Swiss-Prot record:
Residues 17-328 form the Peptidase A1 domain. Belongs to the peptidase A1 family. Coiled coil: none annotated. It catalyses: Hydrolysis of proteins with specificity similar to that of pepsin A, prefers hydrophobic residues at P1 and P1', but does not cleave 14-Ala-|-Leu-15 in the B chain of insulin or Z-Glu-Tyr. Clots milk. Keywords: Aspartyl protease, Disulfide bond, Hydrolase, Protease, Signal, Zymogen. The keyword Disulfide bond applies. The active site is at 35, 199. The lineage of its organism: Eukaryota, Fungi, Dikarya, Ascomycota, Pezizomycotina. Its EC number is 3.4.23.22. The keyword Transferase does not apply. This is Endothiapepsin. It is an enzyme of class 3 (hydrolase).
């Protein structure tokens, strides 16, 4: 089997991407944030505290003939931005782009933090990291990809995120029309439950490539590119008027400035992030100060190749017995 679904930016800045997902029988379609940095599929639901729902589409398991309570199961998750959610668990039929999993754990939110309530466009998350990070207790649950894997033509999914435009998540096949050149594959460590890999270095604009190992994760659920302070300083030093602002919480730059590209290494290959991808707009409405898309990972404890980086590539998440990551230009 295979599946193929379009993923769409939630706003004009690509702050996140939503993908439609069919849950239950008859289908209830919710727009989920596909997140290769976590491993829970959770949704706004008929069980979510009423005051914490504001515009989202909810899953109502009582209206699904295939929903079954996963008796005794609870879940609770916190994300790197300080947001959180928790609740109980059903199993149900879940389809993505024509690919169907029966018996998928669908984690129903009883509580969500304000960040989730305030974002009307995201109805929940669909985790695509390794199932060892899944928070369901007492019985850890598998991700949608883990459950689908054996049925797939090939044990892979691919992320092809758009810049200010829709893109594609494919399951079970590599679309050879969707990228240029070849796909370069690189080793993955699963020890922390992430798609964790080592970049071979970087360049800023037309500058010379610096060979240096940068360990980090491929995370579709993080918006920006978070790298070591040395790397990030070298980038913003090439932007006139850029500064790190403690009050704003990162590097900002005048919107009149030209942003250089940023290149990162994948083995001997190179992925170029165009300068425009690094512009995340005014820090507040009407401001001439713009928020940067490359920020320091200092204090996160890990480097994160988020959407800013991933959307410059066609990315293969290879879930073979020994997982690997592939990157191609596009």
């Amino acid at each position: 089997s295979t599946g193929s679904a379009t993923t769409t930016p939630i706003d004009s800045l690509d702050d996140a991407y939503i993908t439609p997902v069919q849950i239950g029988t008859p289908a209830q379609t919710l727009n989920l944030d596909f997140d290769t940095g976590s491993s829970d599929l959770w949704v706004f639901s008929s069980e979510t505290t009423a005051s914490e729902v504001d515009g989202q589409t909810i899953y109502t398991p009582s209206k699904s003939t295939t929903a079954k309570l996963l008796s005794g199961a609870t879940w609770s998750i916190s994300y790197g931005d300080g947001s959180s959610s928790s609740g109980d668990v059903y199993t149900d039929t879940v389809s993505v782009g024509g690919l169907t999993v029966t018996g998928q754990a669908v984690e129903s939110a009883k509580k969500v933090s304000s960040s989730f309530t305030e974002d009307s466009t995201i109805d929940g998350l669909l985790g695509l990291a390794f199932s060892t990070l899944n928070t369901v207790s007492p019985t850890q649950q598998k991700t949608f990809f883990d459950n689908a894997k054996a049925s797939l033509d090939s044990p892979v999914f691919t992320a092809d995120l758009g810049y200010h435009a829709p893109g594609t998540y494919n399951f079970g096949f590599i679309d050879t029309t969707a990228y240029t050149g070849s796909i370069t594959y690189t080793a993955v460590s699963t020890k922390q439950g992430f798609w964790e890999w080592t970049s071979t270095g970087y360049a800023v604009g037309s500058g010379t490539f610096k060979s240096t190992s940068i360990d980090g994760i491929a995370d579709t659920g993080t918006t920006l590119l978070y790298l070591p302070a040395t790397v990030v300083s070298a980038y913003w030093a090439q932007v006139s008027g850029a500064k790190s602002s403690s009050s704003v919480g990162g590097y900002v730059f005048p919107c009149s400035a030209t942003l250089p590209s940023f290149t990162f290494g994948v083995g001997s290959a190179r992925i170029v992030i165009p300068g425009d991808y690094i512009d995340f707009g005014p820090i507040s409405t009407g401001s001439s100060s713009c928020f940067g898309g490359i920020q320091s990972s200092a204090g996160i404890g890990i480097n994160i190749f988020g959407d800013v980086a991933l959307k410059a590539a066609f990315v293969v998440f290879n879930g073979a017995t020994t997982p690997t990551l592939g990157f191609a230009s596009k």
